[PDB]
Design a protein around this ligand. Structure first.
Ligand SMILES: *[C@@H]1O[C@H](CO)[C@@H](O[C@@H]2O[C@H](CO)[C@@H](O)[C@H](O)[C@H]2NC(C)=O)[C@H](O)[C@H]1NC(C)=O
Lengths: 53, 53
């Protein structure tokens, strides 16, 4: 039982983030936790503060 | 009528009830009280040796 309940926590943790991603997608926004966004900072040279905008 | 087509009004269900699906962990340690009760009544019998002789 403890072996099962230890793995259940990871399922809950994934569920929370997946629900947040679904909300963001239904909201016509971008969830940057699921996307890298580090490759396009080098292709177009911008400051750290300009990338936040 | 004329060129426009008319459709009947739609009736609406007054109430809805929410009964979400829940995961089944199926733990096995619970509902095992009978084994504990059996453990309680071990009842080891020891007879004094030398009282008879
Ligand atoms: C709550 O307990 C009931 C009864 O033990 C569980 O219902 C059983 O579920 C299993 C798995 O689907 C079935 O094979 C049995 O036939 C069910 N029994 C009855 C009497 O319905 C139920 O799954 C438990 N709830 C949770 C969330 O674990």
């Amino acid at each position: 039982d403890i072996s099962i309940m230890e793995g259940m926590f990871a399922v809950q943790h994934v569920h929370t983030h997946l629900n947040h991603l679904r909300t963001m997608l239904m909201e016509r926004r971008i969830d940057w936790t699921y996307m890298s966004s580090s490759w396009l900072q080098t292709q177009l040279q911008k400051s750290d503060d300009e990338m936040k905008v | 009528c004329f060129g426009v087509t008319f459709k009947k009004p739609l009736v609406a269900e007054e109430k809805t009830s929410l009964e979400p699906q829940l995961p089944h962990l199926q733990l096995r340690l619970p509902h095992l009280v009978g084994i504990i009760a059996k453990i309680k009544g071990i009842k080891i019998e020891v007879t004094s040796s030398g009282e008879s002789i």
